[PDB]
Write a protein that binds this ligand. Structure first.
Ligand SMILES: *[C@@H]1O[C@H](CO)[C@@H](O[C@@H]2O[C@H](CO)[C@@H](O)[C@H](O)[C@H]2NC(C)=O)[C@H](O)[C@H]1NC(C)=O
Ligand SMILES: [Ca+2]
Lengths: 54, 50
């Protein structure tokens, strides 16, 4: 149902870059999610993997 | 977040609480037990008189 043309959207009226809203920077690679107590599952810690795993 | 699974800590890390949420690193000159529940001191090996 939805159709959006991104080429004609001006973010904040001047910027041409899509903003960011995720509560947590993405884990890059070779790393594991973590848990922060008392906070929603959307927000994590990006812990590194144990030795001998991938 | 209320729903979770339990995974054992890796070698050299322990925990002593109900819901750990993280594996505590063993301090220096110590190593994890068989069950990863309490650090114990390492062993020194040398040609002794005993
Ligand atoms: C912000 O978070 C969303 C979801 O939490 C990310 O969307 C995911 O992006 C990856 C690739 O980067 C895809 O493989 C997933 O399928 C996406 N998830 C969903 C539900 O669509 C988004 O990438 C994050 N933003 C940044 C800048 O990393
Ligand atoms: Ca809360």
């Amino acid at each position: 149902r939805l159709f959006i043309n991104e080429e004609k959207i001006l973010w904040s009226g001047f910027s041409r870059e899509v903003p960011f809203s995720n509560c947590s920077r993405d884990c890059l690679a070779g790393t594991r999610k973590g848990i922060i107590e008392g906070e929603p599952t959307c927000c994590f810690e990006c812990v590194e993997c144990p030795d001998g795993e991938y | 977040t209320c729903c979770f699974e339990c995974v054992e800590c890796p070698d050299g890390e322990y925990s002593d609480e109900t819901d750990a949420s993280a594996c505590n690193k063993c301090p220096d000159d110590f190593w994890s037990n068989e069950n990863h529940t309490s650090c114990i001191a390492k062993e020194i090996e040398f040609l002794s008189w005993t």
